[PDB]
Amino acid sequence: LILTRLLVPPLCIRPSVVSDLKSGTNEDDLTMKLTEIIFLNDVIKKHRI
Amino acid sequence: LPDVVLKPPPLFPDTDYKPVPLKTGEGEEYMLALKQELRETMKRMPYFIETPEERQDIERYSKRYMKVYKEEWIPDWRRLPREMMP
Amino acid sequence: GVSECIIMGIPMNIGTGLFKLLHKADRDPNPPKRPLIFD
Amino acid sequence: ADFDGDEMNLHLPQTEEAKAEALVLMGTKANLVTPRNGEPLIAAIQDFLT
Amino acid sequence: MEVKDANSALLSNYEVFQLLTDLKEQRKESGKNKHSSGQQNLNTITYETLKYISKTPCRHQSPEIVREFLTALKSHKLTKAEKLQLLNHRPVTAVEIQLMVEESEERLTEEQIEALLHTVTS
Amino acid sequence: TEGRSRDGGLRLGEMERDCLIGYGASMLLLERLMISSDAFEVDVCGQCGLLGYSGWCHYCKSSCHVSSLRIPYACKLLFQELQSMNIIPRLKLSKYN
Amino acid sequence: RCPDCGSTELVEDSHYSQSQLVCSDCGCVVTEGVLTTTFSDEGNLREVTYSRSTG
Amino acid sequence: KEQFRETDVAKKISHICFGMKSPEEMRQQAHIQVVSKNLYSQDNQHAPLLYGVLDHRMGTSEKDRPCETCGKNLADCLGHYGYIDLELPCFHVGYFRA
Amino acid sequence: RITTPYMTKYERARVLGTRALQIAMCAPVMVELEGETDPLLIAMKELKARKIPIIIRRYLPDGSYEDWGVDELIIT
Amino acid sequence: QGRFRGNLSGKRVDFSGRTVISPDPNLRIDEVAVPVHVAKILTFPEKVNKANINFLRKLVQNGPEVHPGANFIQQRHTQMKRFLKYGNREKMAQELKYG
Amino acid sequence: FVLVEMVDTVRIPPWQFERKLNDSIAEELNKKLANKVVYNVGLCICLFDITKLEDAYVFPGDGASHTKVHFRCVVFHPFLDEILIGKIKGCSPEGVHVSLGFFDDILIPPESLQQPAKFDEAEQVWVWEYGEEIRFRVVDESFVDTSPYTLVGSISEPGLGLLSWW
Ligand SMILES: [Zn+2]
Ligand SMILES: [Zn+2]
Ligand SMILES: [Zn+2]
């Protein structure tokens, strides 16, 4: 019940659209949440060090 | 801000602290020897029940020669309930 | 149930899926067995 | 329906078993009555009763 | 595709020969084109096994002779594997029973070999 | 897709599903919701009950108990989302007989 | 090239709202069907720029 | 010569047994480890980083870039999961009442 | 022998669909069709003629089963 | 619009069309009119058998242009579809095998 | 040669209904078990007979007739001591390559027990003098599919004398 590993799903669940009309792409919210989680983990590791 | 990491951390990260060596002494040596003797002698003990082999290929005249023979201890049926008799 | 069947993509038990059909093929149940000569 | 611009859907089965089941169970000639009370719904309408 | 018993009952070469002959005659009587083109390994394996069993001396055998040989060996307290090997090989010489056949020690007796040869040759 | 300009098809809503269930056309409902909408073949491991790929189970590192199975792509996506949520649906397959 | 005749006359011709790369010699269908996000997916997805996604 | 192996079986699902996975089972199920917080590379091609998010080894989402784990296109790729280890454990909101 | 002898509409539909699929899969015809290019029409003709080689296996809730032939059942 | 209600209970399908309705008393109660434009788009997969072989041959010779016809053919051996708009339709009709 | 009990779910297409069910099942089983080695069983030759054949079901999918048939099949699986007569289909330095008559080229007798004049110099030399007999010793099977043969066995050739051929 207490989680120590997060299961990032495949890319089929996180569709990404390459919008060549601008310098950006359309990404889902799960990708941003996982990116924020990884950033927070890195920040916690930096603070611990 | 925290820097980004390209490759993942090592599966077995190194540590600057090593385990303290094992205590030496005739006592420890004798305990090790006794534990090894127990490991070697308890497998052949009748209490060590092995997986009953099955699915024999054929019967041969050498069956009586290769027949495994080992004495079997008799449990105390007075102390053990009746639900364990063969 | 029916909802789980529809979700999994299998014929629901209700309706036409409650029973099963058999083929009326020309056969012979328990055909003659070849006798064993060596045994 | 009242023929006042209503958009209806039309589907084509892709299996012989589904086709047969749709023709038998969902047949117009076999579903001329409703299971609520058995009254016939497929009957005459305006411009026909008169 | 699971199997229930891989050693249900042993059989000699005469049964396999009869089965292969029956399959071959049924095939040449009801030959099909598409069924044969779908899998040609069946024809090859059947033909080669039949050719091997014809090369071997398994010919000139019958169920009556097999039953007679079995009843004759039943009086020799010989084991199923020994009698099966003897029926499959049809040894005409004595050395083939003296050395080739296993479990020779205490079973030859130097007197039963003549009876075994007579029974396998009759 | 949804819209006509996007080359979208009709929607068999919950009311249509209820009507089909009331009629009892099980094969019709199946052909509509599974065969002609999101038909797809996956590989399920008969040992752990997980989903593999190309007839291979990365969990058990074996391919003897892996077998194909028809399943809606929406149901497969739901199973993947649950496995991500840590709710692991263990599928125990068996013969159709 | 075509898997049947080996010809290189592969043309992308949409047949009644169905993108399909089909050969022009024998009509063999090489590839068919394309996956494109719908209005719901486009509205649910959020726009993130390279200034942030690249690093 | 040739071994007997069944090609396809008419397997029918009997029942779904829900459950949970431990960290060890999650690691065993996952294929790679995602540790990079960025998505694409610095080059102008904007290719996805390795051992990071949006990696093609955990499936594919583009019709041009196929999957790296299995040599198949998007229409045939089923996808693969990944495991991300956390420094400190956290309560699972779904199982917090439990 | 305890169930109703009449053949229900669901059984009718399932039998007709199965026979139409078999015929579309190049199955033998036992009625000598006369220019019927529709497998469903051929199946309906075979049902009316009572020559469909299919046996319904009705299962009871407890687990028992009973066989009923198309020619043995009553049609409407 | 969830996975249970939006993608499992109610989902979209193909081979369907939405159109306006109009009155026509000259048709039976069990009959419905379908326009040629939607009929040429909505196709039905028919298996080649010993009964409708000539009908399928005629439909293939007609082709996608004429209303009575077909649009694609999937061979029994190979699952590679063939577009009737390209290539000689007469050869495809003459090489129609069962299955 | 030995019988093996098997239970297989055979699927017969509809266009074979004109044929007899038992004959079709036998032909399908033969085509499916022709020249194939079943793990821990041996190499199957052909079908012997059919014992039990229950009702024939028809699923709502493919529409074919699926029948669960119990049958017995003959397989080549010695009993670790069987004697056979094969032919030398070549020879290698580490060991001769003998093969039963047109049956299977999988017998690899190790040359580590004959009298102490055993050696192969690649010139197809069998053995220095003082229809080849074979004595099976052990069996062994292995799998094939391990990513996204299977029967060799061990042969023995003791000092059988062989008065007919050295
Ligand atoms: Zn597994
Ligand atoms: Zn081409
Ligand atoms: Zn993949």
Curated annotation (Swiss-Prot), chain A:
It comes from the Eukaryota. Belongs to the RNA polymerase beta' chain family. It comes from Homo sapiens (Human). The chain holds residues 250 to 298 of 1390 of the full protein. This is DNA-directed RNA polymerase III subunit RPC1. Catalytic core component of RNA polymerase III (Pol III), a DNA-dependent RNA polymerase which synthesizes small non-coding RNAs using the four ribonucleoside triphosphates as substrates. Synthesizes 5S rRNA, snRNAs, tRNAs and miRNAs from at least 500 distinct genomic loci. Pol III-mediated transcription cycle proceeds through transcription initiation, transcription elongation and transcription termination stages. During transcription initiation, Pol III is recruited to DNA promoters type I, II or III with the help of general transcription factors and other specific initiation factors. Expressed in the brain, in the cortex and the white matter (at protein level). It is found in: Nucleus; Cytoplasm, Cytosol. The gene is POLR3A.
Curated annotation (Swiss-Prot), chain B:
GO terms for cellular component: cytosol; nuclear body; nucleoplasm; nucleus; RNA polymerase III complex. One of its GO terms (biological process) is positive regulation of interferon-beta production. Its main location: nucleus. It is found in: Nucleus; Cytoplasm. GO terms for molecular function: chromatin binding; DNA-directed RNA polymerase activity. Keywords: Antiviral defense, Cytoplasm, DNA-directed RNA polymerase, Immunity, Innate immunity, Nucleus, Phosphoprotein, Transcription. The keyword Nucleotidyltransferase does not apply. Barely detectable in differentiated tissues. Expressed in embryonic stem cells and in other dividing cells, such as some tumor cell lines. Induction: Induced by NANOG and POU5F1/OCT4. Negatively regulated by the interaction of microRNA MIR1305 with 3 miRNA responsive elements (miREs) in its 3'-UTR. Transcriptionally regulated by MYC. down-regulated upon cell differentiation. Coiled coil: none annotated. The keyword Glycoprotein does not apply. It comes from the Eukaryota. Belongs to the eukaryotic RPC7 RNA polymerase subunit family. This is DNA-directed RNA polymerase III subunit RPC7. It comes from Homo sapiens. The lineage of its organism: Eukaryota, Metazoa, Chordata, Craniata, Vertebrata. The gene is POLR3G.
Swiss-Prot record, chain I:
It is found in: Nucleus; Nucleus, Nucleolus. GO terms for cellular component: cytosol; fibrillar center; nucleoplasm; nucleus; RNA polymerase I complex; RNA polymerase II, core complex; RNA polymerase III complex. Keywords: Acetylation, DNA-directed RNA polymerase, Nucleus, Phosphoprotein, Transcription. Its main location: nucleus. GO terms for molecular function: DNA binding; DNA-directed RNA polymerase activity. One of its GO terms (biological process) is transcription by RNA polymerase I. DNA-dependent RNA polymerase catalyzes the transcription of DNA into RNA using the four ribonucleoside triphosphates as substrates. Common component of RNA polymerases I, II, and III which synthesize ribosomal RNA precursors, mRNA precursors and many functional non-coding RNAs, and small RNAs, such as 5S rRNA and tRNAs, respectively. Pol II is the central component of the basal RNA polymerase II transcription machinery. Pols are composed of mobile elements that move relative to each other. Belongs to the archaeal Rpo6/eukaryotic RPB6 RNA polymerase subunit family. This is DNA-directed RNA polymerases I, II, and III subunit RPABC2. The chain holds residues 51 to 126 of 127 of the full protein.
UniProtKB/Swiss-Prot annotation, chain K:
One of its GO terms (cellular component) is cytosol. InterPro entries: NA-bd_OB-fold (IPR012340), RNA_pol_III_Rbc25 (IPR013238), RNA_pol_Rpb7-like_N_sf (IPR036898), RNAP_E/RPC8 (IPR004519), Rpb7-like (IPR045113), Rpb7-like_N (IPR005576). It is found in: Nucleus. One of its GO terms (molecular function) is DNA-directed RNA polymerase activity. Its main location: nucleus. Keywords: Antiviral defense, DNA-directed RNA polymerase, Immunity, Innate immunity, Nucleus, Transcription. One of its GO terms (biological process) is defense response to virus. It comes from the Eukaryota. The keyword Transcription applies. It holds the Pfam family SHS2_Rpb7-N. The keyword Transport does not apply. Disulfide bonds: none annotated. DNA-dependent RNA polymerase catalyzes the transcription of DNA into RNA using the four ribonucleoside triphosphates as substrates. Specific peripheric component of RNA polymerase III (Pol III) which synthesizes small non-coding RNAs including 5S rRNA, snRNAs, tRNAs and miRNAs from at least 500 distinct genomic loci. With CRCP/RPC9 forms a mobile stalk that protrudes from Pol III core and functions primarily in transcription initiation. Pol III plays a key role in sensing and limiting infection by intracellular bacteria and DNA viruses. Belongs to the eukaryotic RPB7/RPC8 RNA polymerase subunit family. This is DNA-directed RNA polymerase III subunit RPC8. The gene is POLR3H.
